[PDB]
Design an enzyme around this catalytic site. Structure first.
Site, PDB file in Angstrom:
ATOM      1  N   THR A  42      -0.110   3.357  -8.181  1.00  0.00           N
ATOM      2  CA  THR A  42      -0.540   4.725  -8.427  1.00  0.00           C
ATOM      3  C   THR A  42       0.496   5.479  -9.245  1.00  0.00           C
ATOM      4  OG1 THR A  42      -1.722   4.631  -6.339  1.00  0.00           O
ATOM      5  CG2 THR A  42      -1.438   6.775  -7.331  1.00  0.00           C
ATOM      6  N   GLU A  44       0.811  -1.222   0.000  1.00  0.00           N
ATOM      7  CA  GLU A  44       0.000   0.000   0.000  1.00  0.00           C
ATOM      8  C   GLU A  44       0.842   1.268   0.000  1.00  0.00           C
ATOM      9  OE1 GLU A  44      -2.633  -0.357   3.260  1.00  0.00           O
ATOM     10  OE2 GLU A  44      -4.001  -1.720   2.227  1.00  0.00           O
ATOM     11  N   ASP A  89       5.722  -2.974 -12.336  1.00  0.00           N
ATOM     12  CA  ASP A  89       4.889  -2.858 -11.149  1.00  0.00           C
ATOM     13  C   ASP A  89       4.814  -4.221 -10.485  1.00  0.00           C
ATOM     14  OD1 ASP A  89       3.159  -2.047  -9.176  1.00  0.00           O
ATOM     15  OD2 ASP A  89       1.471  -1.671 -10.516  1.00  0.00           O
ATOM     16  N   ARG A 102      -8.010   1.701  -5.077  1.00  0.00           N
ATOM     17  CA  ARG A 102      -7.015   0.789  -4.526  1.00  0.00           C
ATOM     18  C   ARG A 102      -7.358  -0.638  -4.936  1.00  0.00           C
ATOM     19  NH1 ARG A 102      -6.414  -3.618  -0.485  1.00  0.00           N
ATOM     20  NH2 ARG A 102      -4.217  -3.523   0.152  1.00  0.00           N
ATOM     21  N   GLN A 145       3.026  -6.842  -0.709  1.00  0.00           N
ATOM     22  CA  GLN A 145       2.642  -7.640   0.446  1.00  0.00           C
ATOM     23  C   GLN A 145       3.701  -8.701   0.726  1.00  0.00           C
ATOM     24  OE1 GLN A 145      -0.281  -7.478   2.440  1.00  0.00           O
ATOM     25  NE2 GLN A 145      -0.690  -5.520   1.433  1.00  0.00           N
TER      26      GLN A 145
HETATM   27  N1  LIG Z   1      -3.303  10.855  -0.558  1.00  0.00           N
HETATM   28  C1  LIG Z   1      -2.498  10.056  -1.242  1.00  0.00           C
HETATM   29  N2  LIG Z   1      -2.848   8.746  -1.439  1.00  0.00           N
HETATM   30  C2  LIG Z   1      -2.031   7.926  -2.133  1.00  0.00           C
HETATM   31  C3  LIG Z   1      -0.842   8.389  -2.649  1.00  0.00           C
HETATM   32  N3  LIG Z   1      -0.239   7.365  -3.286  1.00  0.00           N
HETATM   33  C4  LIG Z   1      -1.020   6.273  -3.184  1.00  0.00           C
HETATM   34  N4  LIG Z   1      -2.129   6.610  -2.467  1.00  0.00           N
HETATM   35  C5  LIG Z   1      -3.252   5.743  -2.111  1.00  0.00           C
HETATM   36  O1  LIG Z   1      -2.795   4.563  -1.499  1.00  0.00           O
HETATM   37  C6  LIG Z   1      -3.605   3.477  -1.879  1.00  0.00           C
HETATM   38  C7  LIG Z   1      -2.723   2.310  -2.285  1.00  0.00           C
HETATM   39  O2  LIG Z   1      -1.861   2.706  -3.315  1.00  0.00           O
HETATM   40  P1  LIG Z   1      -1.263   1.612  -4.314  1.00  0.00           P
HETATM   41  O3  LIG Z   1      -0.742   2.302  -5.503  1.00  0.00           O
HETATM   42  O4  LIG Z   1      -2.265   0.595  -4.667  1.00  0.00           O
HETATM   43  O5  LIG Z   1      -0.055   0.974  -3.483  1.00  0.00           O
HETATM   44  P2  LIG Z   1       0.609  -0.404  -3.953  1.00  0.00           P
HETATM   45  O6  LIG Z   1       2.063  -0.376  -3.752  1.00  0.00           O
HETATM   46  O7  LIG Z   1       0.269  -0.708  -5.349  1.00  0.00           O
HETATM   47  O8  LIG Z   1      -0.016  -1.511  -2.988  1.00  0.00           O
HETATM   48  P3  LIG Z   1       0.457  -3.019  -3.202  1.00  0.00           P
HETATM   49  O9  LIG Z   1       0.509  -3.237  -4.713  1.00  0.00           O
HETATM   50  O10 LIG Z   1       1.851  -3.220  -2.603  1.00  0.00           O
HETATM   51  S1  LIG Z   1      -0.642  -4.081  -2.473  1.00  0.00           S
HETATM   52  C8  LIG Z   1      -4.486   3.953  -3.011  1.00  0.00           C
HETATM   53  O11 LIG Z   1      -5.788   4.102  -2.519  1.00  0.00           O
HETATM   54  C9  LIG Z   1      -3.985   5.323  -3.357  1.00  0.00           C
HETATM   55  O12 LIG Z   1      -5.073   6.183  -3.556  1.00  0.00           O
HETATM   56  C10 LIG Z   1      -0.489   9.710  -2.452  1.00  0.00           C
HETATM   57  O13 LIG Z   1       0.565  10.137  -2.908  1.00  0.00           O
HETATM   58  N5  LIG Z   1      -1.320  10.542  -1.746  1.00  0.00           N
HETATM   59 MG   LIG Z   2       0.229  -2.349  -6.627  1.00  0.00          MG
END
Ligand SMILES: Nc1nc2c(ncn2[C@@H]2O[C@H](COP(=O)(O)OP(=O)(O)OP(O)(O)=S)[C@@H](O)[C@H]2O)c(=O)[nH]1
Ligand SMILES: [Mg+2]
Lengths: 478, 341
Positions: free
Chosen positions: B28, B23, B174, B152, B178
C-alpha cells in the site's frame, strides 16, 4: 630492479592459472582498486556475472580405478598430466574455456566471458575431439579407458566464491543439467539435449538418446618489490600448498604418495531450496553462499588448523584433507593426530553453520560431512598452469560418506571409527552402506543421539546414485 | 566507457528496502508512492476481496466458540448460498451473489460476528468494500484511488519501483512479509540505503496466519529484533513506520479490546513527556501509540552501538496526505543517511 619484473612475471603466471584470459588481463590493467585493496564492511567482495547463451560440457574417464591400480603414484600423475595436456590442447584449439579438473572429470564452457555465436558447435566438437584423443591415448599408452561426454546450453552465472583456494567456476541449474546428462550418458558418445539441438542445425550423426531406466540426443561423429613479492607469494600459496612449492622449486613436476591422510567433504544440503532464480539470476543467493564459504575459509587461519589443507569447493561442497604436510613425526605427538585435528575442523565447521543460521532469518542451512583416512596420492596437474589435487580410494570413500549421510551429523567410516574411538570420541552405529569396491561397509555417526529416539537406519542399499546437482561426488566413482 | 556513468548514477540512487510482517502495509505504501510521484484485473481482485471477506464472516459465524447466530434467521438459505461458493477457482459474480451479500451485510448477527474479528483471520478492508461493492454491483464503474489503495493482494517475491522526486532517484524494494517469504529478504541486503520497517500497529489483538497462536505485534517485535541485530545490517539505519493509525484509533476508542490483556505492561505505562499529539486527539490513543513506539524503541536502544539509528514515525497508508508528509520527512532523513557513507 629486474627481479621486480621477475616477480611480476611469476604473478602473471599465477593469475592466468586460475582465471580466464579476458578477466586476467582485466586484472592486469588493475581495474577495480577495491579488489586491489582486497589483495593487500557488511558483505565480503565477490565478482559474479549472470551470462546467457553458453554451452557447458562435462566429461568423465570411464574405468579410472583399474587403470590406476598397480601404479607407483608417479606413473599415475605422469600419465594423467599427459591426458589432461592433450585435453588442454584441444581446449585451445576449439576455443572453449576449461573451468577446472576434479578427479577423473574434466569440464569446459563455451564462451562465457566472451560471447560466441557458435558456442554449441565449439562445445560438441571439443567433445568429439576428446573421444578421439582418449582413443589415441588408449592405443599409445595401452590403458583400457574411454570417456562419456555431456553437453547442455543455457544461462550461467560465473565467477569466484571463497577466498582460500579460489578459482573461476560456473554455477546455474544448466550446469547441474550438463552434469546429469554426463551422468546419464553412454561412453564414447556426446550426450546433448534439446537446448543444444534447437540451434545445433543437425550437421552431425544424431540419435534418439533414450534412457534405459526429455528430448535428449546422442552424437557419435560426422619497497614496491616487497609489495609485488608478497602479492605473488599469496597467489602462489593460493594455488598450491607450501611443501609442494618447495619440492617443485627444485624439480619440474610433483607427485607424492601418502600412506595415511584423512579427508572430509562437506555438502550443504538444502541450498537448492534457497536458490530460486526469480530475482536477478540468483547471484544474491550466491553472495550468501560466498559468505558461508568465506567463514569456512576463515577457520583455516586459526593457529591450530595450520596443517589442514583445503583442496577446493565444488558447488556447495567443501573438500579438505589433512596429514599431507606432516612429513616429520614429532617426539611428543600422536602418529594420527592430524585425524584428530581434521575431525575437530569438521566439528568447528558444524559450529560455524550454527552461528551462521542465527543471522539467517526463518531459514536454516544444514550440512552433512563425511570422514575417512588411509593412503592417497597427491599431485600437480598442469605445467604453465597449476592444479593441486589428491586421488585414491580414500577420497572416493569420503565422497561416499558425504553423499550417503544424514544432515547436521558427521558420518565416519569404519577404520576412521577404529582410530577416533581410541581418542575418546563417542559414535553410534548408523548401519551398513554399499560402497563400490568395498561392498557393504560399516559406518558411524558422530553426535550421540542428536535425534530423539531413532539412532539406527540400516536398510539403505540403494544402487542408483544419481546426483541432480554439482556435488563432491563428481570426479569420483567412475 | 559508459559504465562509469551508470556506476555513478547507481551510487546516486536511494535503495529503500521495505520490510515487516504480513499484511502490515508495504504494498500500500508502494502504491501510494506511485500515486504521489508517477486495468480490469484490479476490478477482479477487488471483487475477490469482497467475496473472501463475506465468506470468511459467514464461516466464522459457526466457527466461533459461542456461535453467533443470525439476527434474522430467515437468511439461512443465503448463508448456505455463501457457504456453497466458498471454494471455487473461477466465479463470474452474478447479481444474485451481490443481492445475497448485501442481504447478509444488512443482518445484525452478521455484524455481531464481524465485531469479533480478532478471533479469526479476516482481511483489513472488509468494512469498506462491503459498502463499496454495494456501490459497484453494476459493471460500468472504474475504481477510485482509495479503492485501489484498499485492495489486498498477497505479495510473494521481490518487486521494484523506480520513481524520481525533485531530480533525486529512488528505487524501493517491495517484499512479501509472510513467514515463508522471509528467506528472500537477504537478496536485497546488499548496498541498501535505508530500511523502511512497516508495522501494523492496530494488530495488537490479532494473531498471525501461520500458526494462529502468536500475536501479530509480538511477531513484528521479534522480526524487528531479528533485522536489527543482523550481521549484514549493522551499519544500516531503520526508518520505522507504524502503520494503520486510524484503525488503532477506532480500536482504542471502541473500548472493547484492552492492550493490558495482551501486553500487560501497558497498565503501568505513562505517556512520554516529549509527546507531540495531533490536533484534537484523545490521549488514551496517544498513550497507546507511544506505548507501541516505545516497545520498538526499547529494541532499537538495547543494542546497536551508535552505528545505526531508528526513526519512528506514525503513519496511515490509505491516507495520501499523511504519506506525503512522512515521506518528505523521510526524504530529508535518507538524504542524510546516503551522505553518511
Ligand atoms: N485502514 C487502513 N488499512 C490499511 C492501511 N495500510 C494497509 N491497509 C490495508 O491492509 C491490507 C494489506 O495491506 P498490504 O499493503 O497488502 O500489506 P503487505 O505488507 O503488502 O502484505 P504482505 O505483502 O506482507 S502479504 C490492505 O487491504 C490495505 O487496504 C492503513 O494505513 N489504513
Ligand atoms: Mg505486499
Amino acid at each position: 630492479g629486474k627481479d621486480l619484473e621477475v616477480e611480476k612475471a611469476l604473478k602473471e603466471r599465477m593469475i592466468h592459472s586460475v582465471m580466464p584470459r579476458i578477466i586476467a588481463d582485466d586484472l592486469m590493467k588493475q581495474g577495480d582498486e577495491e579488489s586491489e585493496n582486497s589483495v593487500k564492511i557488511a558483505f565480503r567482495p565477490f565478482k559474479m556475472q549472470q551470462i546467457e547463451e553458453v554451452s557447458i560440457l562435462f566429461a568423465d574417464i570411464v574405468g579410472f580405478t583399474k587403470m590406476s591400480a598397480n601404479k607407483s603414484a608417479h606413473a599415475l600423475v605422469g600419465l594423467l598430466n599427459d591426458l589432461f595436456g592433450r585435453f588442454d590442447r584441444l581446449c585451445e584449439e576449439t576455443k572453449c574455456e576449461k573451468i577446472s579438473t576434479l578427479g577423473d572429470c574434466y569440464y569446459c564452457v563455451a564462451g562465457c566471458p566472451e560471447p560466441r555465436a557458435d558456442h554449441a558447435y565449439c562445445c560438441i566438437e571439443m567433445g568429439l575431439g576428446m573421444i578421439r584423443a582418449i582413443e589415441q591415448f588408449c592405443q599409445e599408452k595401452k590403458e583400457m579407458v574411454n570417456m562419456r561426454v555431456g553437453v547442455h546450453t543455457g544461462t550461467v552465472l560465473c565467477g569466484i566464491l571463497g577466498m582460500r583456494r579460489f578459482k573461476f567456476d560456473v554455477w546455474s541449474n544448466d550446469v547441474n543439467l550438463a552434469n546429469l546428462m554426463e551422468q546419464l550418458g553412454v561412453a564414447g558418445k556426446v550426450h546433448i539435449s534439446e537446448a543444444t539441438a534447437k540451434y545445433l542445425d543437425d550437421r552431425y550423426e544424431m540419435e534418439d538418446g533414450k534412457v534405459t531406466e526429455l528430448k535428449t540426443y546422442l552424437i557419435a561423429g560426422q619497497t614496491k618489490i616487497q609489495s609485488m613479492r608478497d602479492q605473488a607469494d599469496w597467489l602462489l600459496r593460493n594455488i598450491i600448498p607450501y611443501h609442494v612449492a618447495e619440492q617443485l622449486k627444485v624439480s619440474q613436476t610433483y607427485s607424492k604418495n601418502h600412506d595415511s591422510g584423512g579427508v572430509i567433504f562437506a555438502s550443504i544440503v538444502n541450498f537448492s531450496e534457497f536458490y530460486e532464480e526469480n530475482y536477478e539470476g540468483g547471484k544474491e543467493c550466491y553472495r550468501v553462499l560466498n559468505e558461508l564459504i568465506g567463514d569456512f575459509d576463515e577457520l583455516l587461519s586459526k593457529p591450530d588448523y595450520s596443517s589442514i589443507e583445503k583442496i577446493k569447493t565444488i558447488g556447495a561442497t567443501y573438500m579438505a584433507a589433512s596429514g599431507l604436510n606432516a612429513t616429520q613425526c614429532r617426539d611428543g605427538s600422536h602418529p594420527q593426530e592430524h585425524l584428530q585435528i581434521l575431525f575437530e575442523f569438521a566439528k568447528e565447521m558444524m559450529r560455524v553453520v550454527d552461528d551462521f543460521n542465527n543471522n539467517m532469518l526463518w531459514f536454516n542451512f544444514k550440512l552433512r560431512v563425511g570422514f575417512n583416512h588411509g593412503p592417497l596420492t597427491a599431485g600437480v596437474i598442469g605445467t604453465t598452469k597449476l592444479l593441486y589435487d589428491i586421488w585414491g580410494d580414500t577420497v572416493n570413500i569420503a565422497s561416499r560418506m558425504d553423499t550417503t549421510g544424514v544432515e547436521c551429523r558427521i558420518q565416519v567410516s569404519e577404520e576412521s571409527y577404529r582410530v577416533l574411538s581410541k581418542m575418546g570420541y563417542e559414535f553410534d552405529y548408523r548401519g551398513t552402506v554399499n560402497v563400490k569396491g568395498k561392498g557393504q561397509m560399516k559406518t558411524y555417526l558422530y553426535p550421540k543421539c542428536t535425534d530423539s529416539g531413532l539412532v539406527p537406519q540400516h536398510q539403505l542399499s540403494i544402487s542408483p546414485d544419481i546426483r541432480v546437482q554439482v556435488d563432491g561426488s563428481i570426479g569420483r566413482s567412475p | 566507457k559508459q559504465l562509469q556513468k551508470d556506476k555513478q548514477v547507481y551510487r546516486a540512487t536511494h535503495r529503500l528496502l521495505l520490510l515487516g510482517a504480513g499484511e502490515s502495509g508495504k504494498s500500500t505504501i508502494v502504491k501510494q508512492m506511485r500515486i504521489l510521484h508517477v486495468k480490469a484485473t484490479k476490478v477482479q481482485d477487488i471483487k475477490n476481496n469482497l467475496k473472501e471477506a463475506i465468506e470468511t464472516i459467514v464461516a466464522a459465524m459457526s466457527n466461533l466458540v459461542p456461535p453467533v447466530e443470525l439476527a434474522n434467521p430467515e437468511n439461512q438459505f443465503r448463508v448456505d448460498y455463501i457457504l456453497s461458493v466458498m471454494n471455487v477457482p473461477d466465479f463470474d459474480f452474478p447479481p444474485e451473489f451481490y443481492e445475497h451479500a448485501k442481504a447478509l451485510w444488512e443482518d445484525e448477527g452478521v455484524r455481531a460476528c464481524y465485531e469479533r474479528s480478532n478471533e479469526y483471520q479476516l482481511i483489513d478492508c472488509a468494512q469498506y468494500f462491503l459498502d463499496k461493492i454495494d456501490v459497484i454491483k453494476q459493471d460500468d464503474y472504474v475504481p477510485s484511488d482509495q479503492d485501489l489503495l484498499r485492495c489486498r493482494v498477497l505479495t510473494s517475491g521481490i518487486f521494484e519501483t523506480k520513481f524520481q522526486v525533485d531530480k533525486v532517484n529512488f528505487h524501493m524494494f517491495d517484499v512479501g512479509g509472510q513467514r515463508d517469504e522471509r528467506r528472500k529478504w537477504i537478496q536485497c541486503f546488499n548496498d541498501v540505503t535505508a530500511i523502511i520497517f512497516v508495522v501494523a500497529s492496530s494488530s495488537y489483538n490479532m494473531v498471525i496466519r501461520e500458526d494462529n497462536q502468536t500475536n501479530r505485534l509480538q511477531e513484528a517485535l521479534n522480526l524487528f529484533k531479528s533485522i536489527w541485530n543482523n550481521r549484514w545490517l549493522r551499519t544500516i539505519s531503520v526508518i520505522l513506520f507504524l502503520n494503520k493509525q486510524d484503525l488503532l484509533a477506532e480500536k482504542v476508542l471502541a473500548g472493547k479490546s484492552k492492550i493490558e490483556d495482551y501486553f500487560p505492561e501497558f497498565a503501568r505505562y505513562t505517556t512520554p513527556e516529549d509527546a507531540t499529539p495531533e490536533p484534537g486527539e484523545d490521549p488514551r490513543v496517544t498513550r497507546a501509540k507511544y506505548f507501541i513506539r516505545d516497545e520498538f524503541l526499547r529494541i532499537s536502544t538495547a543494542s546497536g552501538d551508535g552505528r545505526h539509528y531508528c526513526y519512528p514515525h506514525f503513519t496511515c497508508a490509505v491516507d495520501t496526505e499523511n504519506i506525503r508528509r512522512v515521506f518528505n520527512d523521510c526524504r530529508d532523513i535518507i538524504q542524510r543517511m546516503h551522505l553518511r557513507q
